[PDB]
Amino acid sequence: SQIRQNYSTEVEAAVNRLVNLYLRASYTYLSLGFYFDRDDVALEGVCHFFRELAEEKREGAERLLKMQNQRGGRALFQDLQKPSQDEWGTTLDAMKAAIVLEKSLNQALLDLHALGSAQADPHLCDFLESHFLDEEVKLIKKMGDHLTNIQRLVQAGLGEYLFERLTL
Amino acid sequence: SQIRQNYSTEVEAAVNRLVNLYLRASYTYLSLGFYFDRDDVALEGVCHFFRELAEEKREGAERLLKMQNQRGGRALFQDLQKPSQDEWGTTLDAMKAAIVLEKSLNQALLDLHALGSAQADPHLCDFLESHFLDEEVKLIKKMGDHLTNIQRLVQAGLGEYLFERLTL
Amino acid sequence: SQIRQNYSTEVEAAVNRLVNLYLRASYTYLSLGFYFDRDDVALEGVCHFFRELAEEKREGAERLLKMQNQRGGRALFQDLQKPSQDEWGTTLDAMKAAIVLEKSLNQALLDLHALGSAQADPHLCDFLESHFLDEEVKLIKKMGDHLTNIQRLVQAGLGEYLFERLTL
Amino acid sequence: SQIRQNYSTEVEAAVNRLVNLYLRASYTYLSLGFYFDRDDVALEGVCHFFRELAEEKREGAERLLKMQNQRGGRALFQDLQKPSQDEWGTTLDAMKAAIVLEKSLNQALLDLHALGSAQADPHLCDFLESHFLDEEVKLIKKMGDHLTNIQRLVQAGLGEYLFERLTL
Amino acid sequence: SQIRQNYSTEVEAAVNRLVNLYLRASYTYLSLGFYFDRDDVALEGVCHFFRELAEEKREGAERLLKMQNQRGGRALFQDLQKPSQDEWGTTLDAMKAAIVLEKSLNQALLDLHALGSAQADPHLCDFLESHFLDEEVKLIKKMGDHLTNIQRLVQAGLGEYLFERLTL
Ligand SMILES: Cc1cccc(C)c1O
Ligand SMILES: Cc1cccc(C)c1O
Numbered sequence: 001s002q003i004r005q006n007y008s009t010e011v012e013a014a015v016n017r018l019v020n021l022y023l024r025a026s027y028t029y030l031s032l033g034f035y036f037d038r039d040d041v042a043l044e045g046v047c048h049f050f051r052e053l054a055e056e057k058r059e060g061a062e063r064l065l066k067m068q069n070q071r072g073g074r075a076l077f078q079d080l081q082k083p084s085q086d087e088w089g090t091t092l093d094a095m096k097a098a099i100v101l102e103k104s105l106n107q108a109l110l111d112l113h114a115l116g117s118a119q120a121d122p123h124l125c126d127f128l129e130s131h132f133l134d135e136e137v138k139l140i141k142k143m144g145d146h147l148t149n150i151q152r153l154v155q156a157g158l159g160e161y162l163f164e165r166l167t168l
Numbered sequence: 169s170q171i172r173q174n175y176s177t178e179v180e181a182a183v184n185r186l187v188n189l190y191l192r193a194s195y196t197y198l199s200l201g202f203y204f205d206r207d208d209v210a211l212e213g214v215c216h217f218f219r220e221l222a223e224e225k226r227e228g229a230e231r232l233l234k235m236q237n238q239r240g241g242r243a244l245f246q247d248l249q250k251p252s253q254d255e256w257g258t259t260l261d262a263m264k265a266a267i268v269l270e271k272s273l274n275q276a277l278l279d280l281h282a283l284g285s286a287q288a289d290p291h292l293c294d295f296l297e298s299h300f301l302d303e304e305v306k307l308i309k310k311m312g313d314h315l316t317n318i319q320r321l322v323q324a325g326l327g328e329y330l331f332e333r334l335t336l
Numbered sequence: 337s338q339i340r341q342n343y344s345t346e347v348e349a350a351v352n353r354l355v356n357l358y359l360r361a362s363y364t365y366l367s368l369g370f371y372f373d374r375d376d377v378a379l380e381g382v383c384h385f386f387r388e389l390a391e392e393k394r395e396g397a398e399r400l401l402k403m404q405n406q407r408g409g410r411a412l413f414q415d416l417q418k419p420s421q422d423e424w425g426t427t428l429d430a431m432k433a434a435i436v437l438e439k440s441l442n443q444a445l446l447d448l449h450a451l452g453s454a455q456a457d458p459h460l461c462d463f464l465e466s467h468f469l470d471e472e473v474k475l476i477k478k479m480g481d482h483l484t485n486i487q488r489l490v491q492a493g494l495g496e497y498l499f500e501r502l503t504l
Numbered sequence: 505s506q507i508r509q510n511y512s513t514e515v516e517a518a519v520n521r522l523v524n525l526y527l528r529a530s531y532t533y534l535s536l537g538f539y540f541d542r543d544d545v546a547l548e549g550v551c552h553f554f555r556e557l558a559e560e561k562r563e564g565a566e567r568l569l570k571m572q573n574q575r576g577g578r579a580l581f582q583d584l585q586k587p588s589q590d591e592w593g594t595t596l597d598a599m600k601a602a603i604v605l606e607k608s609l610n611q612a613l614l615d616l617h618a619l620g621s622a623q624a625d626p627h628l629c630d631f632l633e634s635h636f637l638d639e640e641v642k643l644i645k646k647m648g649d650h651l652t653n654i655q656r657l658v659q660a661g662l663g664e665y666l667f668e669r670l671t672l
Numbered sequence: 673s674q675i676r677q678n679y680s681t682e683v684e685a686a687v688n689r690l691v692n693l694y695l696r697a698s699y700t701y702l703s704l705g706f707y708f709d710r711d712d713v714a715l716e717g718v719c720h721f722f723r724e725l726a727e728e729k730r731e732g733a734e735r736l737l738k739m740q741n742q743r744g745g746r747a748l749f750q751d752l753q754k755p756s757q758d759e760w761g762t763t764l765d766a767m768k769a770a771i772v773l774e775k776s777l778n779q780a781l782l783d784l785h786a787l788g789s790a791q792a793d794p795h796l797c798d799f800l801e802s803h804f805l806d807e808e809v810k811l812i813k814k815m816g817d818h819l820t821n822i823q824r825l826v827q828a829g830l831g832e833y834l835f836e837r838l839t840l
């Protein structure tokens with residue numbers, strides 16, 4: 001690329017993999033959202049929480065793709081694997097699975113940052129710090145707070161209703 | 169009728185029967201509403217939910233009557249049978265009875281649509297699709313969601329109070 | 337499902353397949369969009385045209401998923417296959433590939449409509465007519481108009497620039 | 505300096521050199537701008553593009569000088585070498601020379617960042633990341649996009665006119 | 673002091689001690705607040721309640737310091753002892769500890785008032801009456817009300833959630 005400067009092939013590849021991970025996370029949250037919209041589950045606040053996350057994760061992938069082009073890297077897409085479950089159980093099960101998912105994304109961001117540092121690519125490092133690392137820490141804190149409240153509430157049915165009504 | 173065109177006697181009769189079914193559904197919801205306004209039941213959100221449905225069902229009947237005249241059919245009214253119960257039990261019992269009622273109305277709409285298709289009466293078919301079929305599907309989904317939440321809540325007294333306060 | 341009425345397993349399955357097709361179309365347009373954002377392609381109007389389509393196709397998938405739940409069907413997700421190309425050539429090549437893609441989606445909608453009619457499922461039929469069939473016809477007309485203008489313009493470089501500047 | 509803390513003489517010197525490079529880049533863009541304002545060149549959008557860059561590069565130098573003082577370093581100025589050309593040829597030639605210039609500035613920023621990291625000077629590192637590195641990547645992407653469009657357009661005279669009229 | 677009038681050394685010393693007690697109370701509430709912000713505690717209304725009290729107690733200390741200077745006394749600061757606990761248990765435990773703390777501050781205010789009366793220092797007496805005594809009585813009443821509601825609620829987990837959601 002005429003513009004490409006200080007952008008390693010290793011980082012270019014890792015950014016494409018991270019795009020895949022973000023899109024897959026978006027897909028998982030799409031599945032979570034619509035599961036809570038089932039007439040036999042029917043927790044609308046929970047559905048909204050996960051649909052909003054689907055949107056955030058898609059947006060993250062697009063920001064990565066924009067950056068890939070800004071640096072003169074080449075976007076390469078792979079299949080998006082279907083989410084790991086078809087039914088997501090209780091709000092508690094779902095929030096546990098969400099925190100597992102976010103910790104995996106966070107670890108991928110930290111791995112990519114370490115790669116960037118090793119490659120002396122400060123634009124990449126700052127990009128991740130400025131748009132992704134703090135967002136992940138904030139989101140994981142919120143999920144952890146939600147998990148704690150869900151657990152203190154679970155008369156499990158009543159607790160699930162009240163969390164959806166009064167927190168979400 | 170000077171205006172009557174492509175409007176079969178079979179559809180004309182079925183529309184009059186459907187008017188009766190809608191008015192009877194309105195009457196049933198009127199009874200449901202005032203039952204929840206009893207001082208010994210006293211669930212105002214539930215009363216409001218059913219009174220609003222009484223109004224929607226009356227409006228549906230009037231839309232059918234307007235259409236009957238637009239097509240040159242002749243409105244014929246029959247007795248409105250009193251609702252099937254004098255007392256409606258718990259919110260859960262009432263929501264189950266509501267969903268039974270709406271599924272019967274939906275089935276009548278689907279039967280009338282099939283009749284219309286068989287009679288090659290596309291204005292009738294579109295009329296039902298445009299004003300009734302989606303409204304019924306949306307309403308049945310909402311009732312199903314409500315039933316699920318009511319069931320998860322039932323300390324049955326506390327659950328009935330909380331559903332009325334926080335959902336309705 | 338407590339709410340499920342007149343909703344065949346065949347339609348339920350076909351709706352899940354159509355969701356997959358819409359999401360895959362969204363993914364393809366995401367790839368098309370970012371290809372035109374490459375510094376060595378650099379046709380921003382073209383990038384915007386396809387990114388807007390990625391959004392429309394995602395929205396279509398979500399509308400289908402909402403409907404699946406409204407009817408008491410169960411959303412089931414499959415892998416999203418990566419787009420058919422990694423690089424999309426000229427605007428002309430890309431618009432040809434877009435029209436191929438939209439005609440395939442349109443044909444799937446028409447197949448699902450025929451299935452719905454065969455199953456006497458008028459809510460499904462109306463749903464597709466009301467939210468998808470006319471949108472596809474309008475979009476295919478616009479793409480065809482664009483293809484014609486692109487072809488009349490191709491001094492191919494100058495023509496590609498002018499179409500992007502003055503049409504898109 | 506009473507305030508100086510963790511600020512190496514090596515970084516202090518490199519910041520003064522970078523100030524010189526930014527001012528020289530401003531001067532080069534001043535020359536580019538006025539060349540495109542010649543009555544026998546007369547591409548006003550091109551003139552405006554480079555005059556705006558002259559301003560951005562001056563501003564960058566002033567931000568560096570402000571930082572030098574904030575850290576207790578001492579600004580030292582050297583001669584500003586005249587730009588490398590007196591006449592800049594076509595818009596294409598000029599945009600190529602601009603991208604060469606920006607890549608040299610970017611490399612100097614990356615060298616200074618590496619120096620900062622080696623000297624464990626995180627304020628310097630963040631300063632460059634926050635005000636300079638992303639601005640350079642964005643600008644180089646825009647120039648690369650412009651170069652691609654210019655190249656696709658070059659009936660070279662007509663292409664140069666159209667790029668100036670419709671892009672700049 | 674040129675301005676000092678009717679201001680005993682005993683009151684001057686007692687005001688400095690009360691400043692210390694108010695700052696220590698602020699510190700204790702800072703600790704309480706951040707404990708309820710832990711991801712494994714996660715009661716945000718409780719966190720906010722105590723952080724607001726940290727602010728009120730700091731403000732009280734500053735008002736005392738302002739008064740010390742207005743009277744020509746000399747502010748003298750001592751170490752601020754760390755709060756008595758590192759973890760504060762349940763909301764109930766925390767509210768009990770808060771009421772213990774406020775009763776100790778109230779008693780110190782009453783002791784200082786008695787000292788003022790004994791020293792015939794009416795400005796001091798009025799100062800405490802006008803800015804501190806009624807505020808303490810109001811705050812202790814509110815805490816007592818909160819304690820009663822917390823106790824009536826403790827399904828202890830559900831009760832703690834509901835108090836935080838609906839009272840705080
Ligand atoms: C709301 C309502 C209920 C029963 C019968 C009639 C005519 C009506 O308007
Ligand atoms: C989940 C998903 C996959 C591909 C493209 C988009 C826009 C999307 O939301």
Ligand SMILES: Cc1cccc(C)c1O
Nearest residue numbers: 695698699702726727730
């Ligand atoms: C809010 C607070 C707590 C402890 C110590 C100080 C000085 C303070 O302002």
